[PDB]
Amino acid sequence: NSIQIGGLFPRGADQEYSAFRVGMVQFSTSEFRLTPHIDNLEVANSFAVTNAFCSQFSRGVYAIFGFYDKKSVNTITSFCGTLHVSFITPSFPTDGTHPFVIQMRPDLKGALLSLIEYYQWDKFAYLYDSDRGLSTLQAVLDSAAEKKWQVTAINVGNINNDKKDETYRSLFQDLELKKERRVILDCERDKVNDIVDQVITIGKHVKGYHYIIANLGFTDGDLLKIQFGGAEVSGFQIVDYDDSLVSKFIERWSTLEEKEYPGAHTATIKYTSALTYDAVQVMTEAFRNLRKQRIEISRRGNAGDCLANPAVPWGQGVEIERALKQVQVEGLSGNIKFDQNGKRINYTINIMELKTNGPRKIGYWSEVDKMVLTEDDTSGLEQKTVVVTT
Amino acid sequence: NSIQIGGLFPRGADQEYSAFRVGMVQFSTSEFRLTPHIDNLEVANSFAVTNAFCSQFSRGVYAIFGFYDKKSVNTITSFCGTLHVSFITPSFPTDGTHPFVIQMRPDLKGALLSLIEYYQWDKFAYLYDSDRGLSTLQAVLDSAAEKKWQVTAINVGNINNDKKDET
Numbered sequence: 001n002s003i004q005i006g007g008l009f010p011r012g013a014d015q016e017y018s019a020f021r022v023g024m025v026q027f028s029t030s031e032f033r034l035t036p037h038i039d040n041l042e043v044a045n046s047f048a049v050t051n052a053f054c055s056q057f058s059r060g061v062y063a064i065f066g067f068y069d070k071k072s073v074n075t076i077t078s079f080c081g082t083l084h085v086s087f088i089t090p091s092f093p094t095d096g097t098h099p100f101v102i103q104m105r106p107d108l109k110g111a112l113l114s115l116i117e118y119y120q121w122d123k124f125a126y127l128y129d130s131d132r133g134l135s136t137l138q139a140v141l142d143s144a145a146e147k148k149w150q151v152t153a154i155n156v157g158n159i160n161n162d163k164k165d166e167t168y169r170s171l172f173q174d175l176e177l178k179k180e181r182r183v184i185l186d187c188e189r190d191k192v193n194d195i196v197d198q199v200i201t202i203g204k205h206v207k208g209y210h211y212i213i214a215n216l217g218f219t220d221g222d223l224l225k226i227q228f229g230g231a232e233v234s235g236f237q238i239v240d241y242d243d244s245l246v247s248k249f250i251e252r253w254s255t256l257e258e259k260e261y262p263g264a265h266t267a268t269i270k271y272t273s274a275l276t277y278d279a280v281q282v283m284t285e286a287f288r289n290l291r292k293q294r295i296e297i298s299r300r301g302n303a304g305d306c307l308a309n310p311a312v313p314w315g316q317g318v319e320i321e322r323a324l325k326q327v328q329v330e331g332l333s334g335n336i337k338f339d340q341n342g343k344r345i346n347y348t349i350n351i352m353e354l355k356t357n358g359p360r361k362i363g364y365w366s367e368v369d370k371m372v373l374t375e376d377d378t379s380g381l382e383q384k385t386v387v388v389t390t
Numbered sequence: 391n392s393i394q395i396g397g398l399f400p401r402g403a404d405q406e407y408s409a410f411r412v413g414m415v416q417f418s419t420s421e422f423r424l425t426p427h428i429d430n431l432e433v434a435n436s437f438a439v440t441n442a443f444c445s446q447f448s449r450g451v452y453a454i455f456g457f458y459d460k461k462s463v464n465t466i467t468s469f470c471g472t473l474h475v476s477f478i479t480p481s482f483p484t485d486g487t488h489p490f491v492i493q494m495r496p497d498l499k500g501a502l503l504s505l506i507e508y509y510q511w512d513k514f515a516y517l518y519d520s521d522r523g524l525s526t527l528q529a530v531l532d533s534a535a536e537k538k539w540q541v542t543a544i545n546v547g548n549i550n551n552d553k554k555d556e557t
Contacts, residue, residue, distance in 0.1 A: 047468040
């Protein structure tokens with residue numbers, strides 16, 4: 001069964017698109033075949049996204065996969081809530097209960113609010129970027145007044161890439177106006193590695209400072225350049241590489257050709273590529289369930305024009321969303337369970353910390369059991385020569 | 391000269407639409423006549439705004455007037471920057487330098503940052519709503535670290551109207 005799927009990939013998301021095509025080979029079946037309409041177009045031009053949206057809406061696709069920006073978070077949810085076409089995304093989570101929006105990336109603020117209580121921080125800075133939204137900023141400001149904190153929040157993403165070394169000197173000099181040791185970065189991993197190189201430029205990676213990287217790709221960032229500087233860096237890795245379900249995929253990952261699959265011949269993988277591979281598992285499990293339920297949705301382009309006034313819904317597409325939220329499968333990021341909004345529940349966020357040996361789990365996060373520490377201390381191996389001032 | 395204009399008014403903006411029609415009587419001339427295509431539609435459903443947009447774009451209008459939401463701030467600027475049709479709005483100001491976006495409401499943060507220095511405040515709360523954007527929140531948080539302030543920011547708009555007395 002040739003089933004039309006979505007292909008709204010950004011330009012430069014090819015490692016995610018390679019890991020998409022890995023699932024296109026791995027999760028293919030003789031029951032049904034996914035029919036790509038790949039649209040490698042920019043995500044900021046939401047008009048160009050809309051033309052890429054309405055072109056596949058003219059195809060009569062049954063499920064749409066792709067990313068979205070904060071310039072397009074209000075775009076896609078306005079279309080998919082009205083046109084009743086389900087959408088699958090690994091991008092940053094939404095805040096409103098939107099129908100037909102199935103998001104692969106779990107929430108991060110619940111582990112992070114658990115983590116600040118674990119470090120018992122009250123006076124700390126919070127550098128951030130606007131692009132993934134500001135609900136995480138809204139989350140920490142609510143617990144700022146609630147737990148009586150002293151937060152120094154500065155948006156760092158607005159500075160251009162032309163002079164992002166001169167202003168960032170003055171940024172930490174402004175942080176030395178209160179002499180903060182506790183910086184929680186919230187940026188893209190390219191912008192994270194920029195800020196790390198600024199810390200390397202000024203030497204705040206020494207002992208005394210502490211850092212928290214607020215993304216799921218903690219292993220994706222360069223830790224070797226700041227492994228032995230002195231500061232302690234915490235983070236989160238949603239995909240445990242020690243899992244054999246992950247490790248057999250990693251053994252299949254690096255062996256692939258870079259000329260065929262760019263970004264594949266690597267030791268590790270981005271979590272955005274991993275959830276993309278996990279999204280193909282969900283879409284395969286969906287239409288296997290529609291094959292088991294024997295509910296026919298096989299329409300032509302009856303969707304047609306997106307400018308239909310009024311645009312009529314088609315309830316077979318509503319049943320698609322109903323089957324997506326019923327999918328209870330495992331993944332590379334653990335158990336994938338959904339609410340009535342398609343958002344992930346009963347997942348596990350691994351608290352990772354940079355140590356002398358490198359990145360290392362100290363515990364995992366749960367939605368109910370909030371922080372559970374692991375007892376894998378290996379006697380600590382050292383006591384690191386306690387600094388005695390006098 | 392009958393010149394097609396925009397009419398993207400929200401439902402319930404009729405006092406603004408009345409004061410629009412006051413200017414339609416007061417600023418009319420025999421040189422040219424403004425040709426309304428009034429679309430009293432909701433501003434949150436940006437899909438419904440888009441159908442109201444493309445209908446006047448099918449008319450071949452020359453300037454478009456109306457409001458926009460934070461659900462439609464990225465909508466209208468993406469259309470007007472690409473389709474090269476000018477847009478006129480009294481709504482909350484944009485942050486990026488967008489072509490074909492003419493905004494009637496002036497900035498407010500410059501007076502407000504002047505005002506906190508006038509009252510010499512450092513420890514203060516800041517209740518706010520998300521709907522007009524959060525750049526004003528971004529403005530006061532930049533001067534919070536710069537002027538060594540103690541800001542208590544709480545988004546109050548997320549609470550529903552059903553129990554907005556108990557919370």
